[PDB]
Design a protein around this nucleic acid. Sequence first.
DNA 1: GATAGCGCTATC
DNA 2: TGATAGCGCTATC
Length: 327
Amino acid sequence: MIEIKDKQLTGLRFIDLFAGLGGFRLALESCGAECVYSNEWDKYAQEVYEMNFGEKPEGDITQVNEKTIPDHDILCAGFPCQAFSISGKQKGFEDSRGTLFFDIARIVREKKPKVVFMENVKNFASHDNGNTLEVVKNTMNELDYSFHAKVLNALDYGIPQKRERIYMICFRNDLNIQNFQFPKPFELNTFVKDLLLPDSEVEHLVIDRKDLVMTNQEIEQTTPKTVRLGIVGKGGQGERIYSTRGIAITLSAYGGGIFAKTGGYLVNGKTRKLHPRECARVMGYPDSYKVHPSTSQAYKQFGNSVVINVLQYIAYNIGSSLNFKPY
DNA sequence: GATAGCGCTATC
DNA sequence: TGATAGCGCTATC
Ligand SMILES: Nc1ncnc2c1ncn2[C@@H]1O[C@H](CSCC[C@H](N)C(=O)O)[C@@H](O)[C@H]1O
């Protein structure tokens, strides 16, 4: 994350729906706002949350009487995306995990926060010929909110990872907010190699495999793109090796493959996956963040998390628009 | 709950 | 196209 001294969101209160690791917290808190509620049902995520914020989230949002949710100004939600990702069986709203948005909508209908800040994957924008986004747009518009959205790739915001997400910022119609804008991109100056941990601490993750077919030669110049170097096995998800001179490929949560969830990188002659701390770093988490003890749950956790640095810029601009109340 | 082999889609 | 990527899917222990 980056330091932000101009704390635009200082007096505001927000809720962290679908908490996960708490990325949305970190993001908004660095901007001065305060978290009044958090919700997350996964047993392991709750533990990491508690270990890092001292609060244990409420359970199954589905059976939470919305009226119980504390008065808030910003509603943050990085709702589930198995149902819309280009990586699955795109069952959209027909999937048991694709209707959470409607849960957001009922919390919004009742509580009416000034801002709704949501996040999901790039394909949510194209899914079902854009009908899902349309349902989300029209549902939001019907509850008296403006709907702003754009696909932003993290590598354009200081983090060496190709995580293309769609961010939807919604403002209550009252506040005539007509000057919101998404952070302007900027040149990448940090690559995977800059975040790697010292070899000594990584040893146990090296994976020498005989089917390591090297398909491309290492690069001399750093590039803001994923340079694939090798393939292992048939080269499916998890069995592709990239150069530490490019940018990390999207980290995933249920991913498989020998280099499961993080992908595999060629670090100093050796082929290995990423340590949980390097995922934290590749996601923009501060090194002070306590990662969960179970490496498998840590990777799952960072896999469906969010790139803080990006949310920081957006939260900042969300704050600016709200604070422009001239006479 | 932890592991890994798979097999599909979107995008230009 | 032809090659790459993907907050994934699911069987086995
Ligand atoms: N019904 C439900 N109630 C509560 N949490 C749920 C849920 N369905 C899914 N979740 C949780 O929703 C989260 C989506 S991932 C969001 C991660 C979060 N933005 C962070 O930065 O890490 C997952 O942790 C998932 O376990």
